[PDB]
Amino acid sequence: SISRFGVNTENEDHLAKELEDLNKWGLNIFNVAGYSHNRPLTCIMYAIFQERDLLKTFRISSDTFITYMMTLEDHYHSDVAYHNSLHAADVAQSTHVLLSTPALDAVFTDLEILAAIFAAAIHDVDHPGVSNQFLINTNSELALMYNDESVLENHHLAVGFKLLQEEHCDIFMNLTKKQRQTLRKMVIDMVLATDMSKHMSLLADLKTMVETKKVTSSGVLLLDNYTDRIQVLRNMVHCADLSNPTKSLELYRQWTDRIMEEFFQQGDKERERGMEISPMCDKHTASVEKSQVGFIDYIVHPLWETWADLVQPDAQDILDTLEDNRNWYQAMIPQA
Numbered sequence: 001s002i003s004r005f006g007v008n009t010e011n012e013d014h015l016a017k018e019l020e021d022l023n024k025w026g027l028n029i030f031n032v033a034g035y036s037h038n039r040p041l042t043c044i045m046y047a048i049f050q051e052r053d054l055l056k057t058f059r060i061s062s063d064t065f066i067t068y069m070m071t072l073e074d075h076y077h078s079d080v081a082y083h084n085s086l087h088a089a090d091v092a093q094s095t096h097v098l099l100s101t102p103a104l105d106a107v108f109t110d111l112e113i114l115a116a117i118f119a120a121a122i123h124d125v126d127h128p129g130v131s132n133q134f135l136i137n138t139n140s141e142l143a144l145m146y147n148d149e150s151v152l153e154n155h156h157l158a159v160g161f162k163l164l165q166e167e168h169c170d171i172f173m174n175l176t177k178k179q180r181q182t183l184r185k186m187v188i189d190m191v192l193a194t195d196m197s198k199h200m201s202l203l204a205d206l207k208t209m210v211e212t213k214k215v216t217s218s219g220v221l222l223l224d225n226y227t228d229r230i231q232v233l234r235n236m237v238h239c240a241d242l243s244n245p246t247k248s249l250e251l252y253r254q255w256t257d258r259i260m261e262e263f264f265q266q267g268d269k270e271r272e273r274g275m276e277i278s279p280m281c282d283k284h285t286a287s288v289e290k291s292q293v294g295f296i297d298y299i300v301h302p303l304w305e306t307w308a309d310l311v312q313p314d315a316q317d318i319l320d321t322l323e324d325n326r327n328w329y330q331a332m333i334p335q336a
C-alpha cells in the first residue's frame with residue numbers, strides 16, 4: 001500500500017485525512033492533488049479500487065495497477081486548464097459515489113462497477129484542450145483519423161486501451177476473454193456517451209426510461225436486462241462529467257475558472273488562425289457568469305432533475321445545491 005508520491009511526511013497524514021471523504025460527494029479533489037504531489041488520478045483510483053475490493057476480486061496486481069494509472073495520468077496534459085488529470089480524478093470519484101446511491105443498490109455486477117470507474121478514469125485522456133468542432137474545422141490529424149465523428153471521445157478510448165497492451169501495464173490480465181470482451185463494449189459505450197453532441201438524445205431516452213421505471217417493493221430500481229443497465233451506466237458517467245455545478249460553491253467556482261481559461265485559450269487560437277471566434281470562447285465579449293447560468297438552465301439541471309427522478313429521493317441534496325449555485329451566478333450578473 002503506497003501512501004505518498006512525494007518527499008513530504010506531513011502529506012501522508014493530510015492525504016489520508018482527505019481520503020476519509022472518499023465515499024462522499026463533498027470530497028475535495030483539489031486537496032487530494034495538493035497532498036499527492038499532483039497524482040490525484042493515480043491516488044484516487046488506488047483508493048477507490050481498494051475501497052471496493054476490485055484488485056482482489058479481479059486479481060489485479062497492486063504493482064501493475066499503479067504503473068498503468070501513473071502512465072494514464074501522464075497522458076493527460078498538465079498544460080490544459082480543465083481537461084487534465086484532476087478532472088478525470090473528479091469524474092472517477094464522482095462516479096464511485098453515484099454507483100452507491102441507494103436506489104441502485106445491488107443492481108450492478110462487479111464487472112460493470114469496474115467498467116464504469118475505468119471509463120471515468122480514461123474518458124478525457126490526451127485531451128488537447130480544444131473542442132471536436134475546432135479539430136474538424138482545422139483539418140487536424142485527429143479529425144482526419146476519425147472522420148469528424150466523436151473525434152476526441154474515440155481518441156480517449158484508443159489511448160486508454162492501447163496502454164493496456166504492454167504486459168507490465170495490463171491491469172485486466174486475469175479477467176477471462178469474455179470478461180475483457182464485455183468490459184470493452186461497456187467502456188466504449190460509456191465514453192462515447194460523454195460526447196456533448198449526443199446529450200439531447202441521451203436525455204430523451206433517459207426521460208423515456210424514467211417514465212416507465214419499476215421501483216421494486218424494497219425501494220430499489222428493477223433493471224432486469226443488460227440494455228437497461230448500460231443505459232443507466234452511460235447516463236451516470238455523463239452526470240459525473242457534468243457534476244461540477246452540483247458540488248459545493250467553493251469547488252464549482254474553481255472548476256468554472258478552469259474551463260473558461262481553457263475555452264478562452266481556444267478562442268485565442270481561433271483568432272490567431274483568422275477563424276470565426278466561437279462566441280463562448282471569446283474572452284473580449286463572453287460573460288463567465290451568464291455561461292454558467294445558461295449551462296445549468298439548458299443542460300445541467302434538465303439532466304440532473306431527470307437523474308433525481310430516477311433515483312428518488314437519493315439526489316435531492318444535489319438538486320438543491322445546483323439551484324443554489326445557479327442562483328449564486330445569476331446574482332453575479334449585474335443586470336436583471
Ligand SMILES: CCn1ncc2c(NC3CCOCC3)c(-c3nc(CC(=O)N4CCCC4)c(Cc4ccccc4)o3)cnc21
Nearest residue numbers: 131132194196241242244245255256259280291294295298
Ligand atoms: C464548470 C462547469 N462545467 N463543466 C463542464 C462544462 C461545459 N462543457 C463541457 C464540455 C465537455 O463535455 C462536457 C461539457 C461548459 C460549456 N460547454 C459549452 C459548449 C459545449 O457543449 N461544448 C464545447 C466543446 C465541448 C462541448 C458551453 C457553452 C454553452 C452552451 C449552452 C448553454 C450555455 C453555455 O458551456 C460549461 N460549464 C461546464
Ligand SMILES: [As]
Nearest residue numbers: 043044046047
Ligand atoms: As493514494
Ligand SMILES: [As]
Nearest residue numbers: 071166168169
Ligand atoms: As506500460
Ligand SMILES: [As]
Nearest residue numbers: 263278280281
Ligand atoms: As467555445
Ligand SMILES: [Mg+2]
Nearest residue numbers: 123124152194
Ligand atoms: Mg470529454
Ligand SMILES: [Zn+2]
Nearest residue numbers: 091123124241
Ligand atoms: Zn470530461
